[PDB]
Design a protein around this ligand. Sequence first.
Ligand SMILES: CC(C)NC(=O)Nc1ccccc1
Lengths: 301, 304
Amino acid sequence: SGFRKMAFPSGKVEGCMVQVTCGTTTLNGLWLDDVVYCPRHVICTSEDMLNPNYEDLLIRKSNHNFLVQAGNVQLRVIGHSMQNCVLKLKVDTANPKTPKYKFVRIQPGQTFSVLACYNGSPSGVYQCAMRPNFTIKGSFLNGSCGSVGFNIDYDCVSFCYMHHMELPTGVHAGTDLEGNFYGPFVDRQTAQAAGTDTTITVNVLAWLYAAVINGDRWFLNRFTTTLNDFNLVAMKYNYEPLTQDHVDILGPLSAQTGIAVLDMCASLKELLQNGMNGRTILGSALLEDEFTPFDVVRQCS
Amino acid sequence: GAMSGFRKMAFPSGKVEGCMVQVTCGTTTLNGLWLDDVVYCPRHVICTSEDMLNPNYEDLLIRKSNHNFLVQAGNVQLRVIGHSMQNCVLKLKVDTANPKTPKYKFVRIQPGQTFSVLACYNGSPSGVYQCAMRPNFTIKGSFLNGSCGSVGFNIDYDCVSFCYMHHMELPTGVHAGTDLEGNFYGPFVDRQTAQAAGTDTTITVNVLAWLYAAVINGDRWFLNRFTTTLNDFNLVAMKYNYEPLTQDHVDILGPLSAQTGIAVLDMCASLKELLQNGMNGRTILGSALLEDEFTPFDVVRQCS
Ligand SMILES: CC(C)NC(=O)Nc1ccccc1
């Protein structure tokens, strides 16, 4: 018993963090093989960062512009290129601490760990989910530009996120490791705000399934709803609509607890309309939405 | 501001990952901590299921030889050249010093203080989380199976301060353990006899540090114009199962009080009203819950 949210052990990622400096700007880079990955906005001054031509500003930088430092050892840039919003700096030295790794792109509602870094130094690690509005909750004290998000599967690190900027609303925004932004954001000093966030409905249901596996059962009722009717009530409460895909992902938990997905959806619809009336689920008075169905399957199976 | 939307973080775990090993005695398998040429693990690794109600560890240990213990780091078998007991922690000397040994200390923590736990299974790091030593001397840990010997730690200036090792799960869902010198936190014993955690309380000094942090970051809806006496506050607080506040904790919040202009007992009056009215969907620093697992030490350093 006991459901604590956990981040992946960060050691494999710690051995890849470096410090990247262009002019006055300093931020974190990801050193894998003989390439350092970092946000492309490190080559911008105050003049440039309003509507910059990144590819034109980038060719006109040499290789020695870039100050790459890994501990006390300065890595030697022997080439640079751009891939969407990530700058790629090929260096002369392969990282001997390079782990088994992959670049993957995740979907809103999926969870990963972030290794918060400052000036290339790892400061802390936390578990989070990609919000439905494609932002990640976190403060200025939860990593600066170039900190990465990742999952670990087997012994392989799946890099899925790189932090590019902190929005004023206590959330940050970024890209995958191929430079494609998550959400309608641009790497520019312009008026940018996150849309209205919603609650990740499939994750709440995963969490309610976890509560049932830990014998927290008071909220279960004999009723079922339709996917159509559940969605009607869900959106009124700023919950995400549930898709038939989400229903299928929840399949294994339904088979392991005996609670059909639309059976559990009736309990969650009741929770939304009446609250918990002074009760708790898994020890919390609030519904958790940063546990994927697979997070529960790992921890509770 | 700086801490708008702050999430709690564990320390980067890599330095501890390098010290985790698997310790087996007979058919019992759990985690050990490999520092220099010593492996530390719970002493009940030497117990059978029948020993667990009333193990005589001194008796069980003297019947063990160095070759009773199987220590494994990855695919490498470490060879035990000695064993001794320090309180509830078993200490296995091995013939190989851990080349990944970080700079480290053994420290005992008080309730309310925070640290990270590297949850491990079969010597293998599985996950990491940040927590506080609860006032009832337990920690709320992961689902678990065989995470005994997982350690809790702080990192400061690349030196790892080891403060906790997991020993047992109480019937409540919470966990109990020792410092790295083998002394339990709280009144628990490493036996399978009927043990129950006391009624847990909210760490009030940590809540007040959190509310102060919210004020530095411009989140001010919960402040009132009232103040209170320390003993009027403690009368109300304990009725909400909040931990009593001492002059020590008043002093500890002193820097935050000076940085915001809000006297500690002023904030206490604000907290008293929060407990009265409740946060009912309203958020502080982006969190819909009164956080009690962030210490005044961390707030002052993150809000210079
Ligand atoms: C509750 C919100 C902030 N999320 C987290 O706390 N993730 C996290 C995971 C492991 C250790 C510390 C934190």
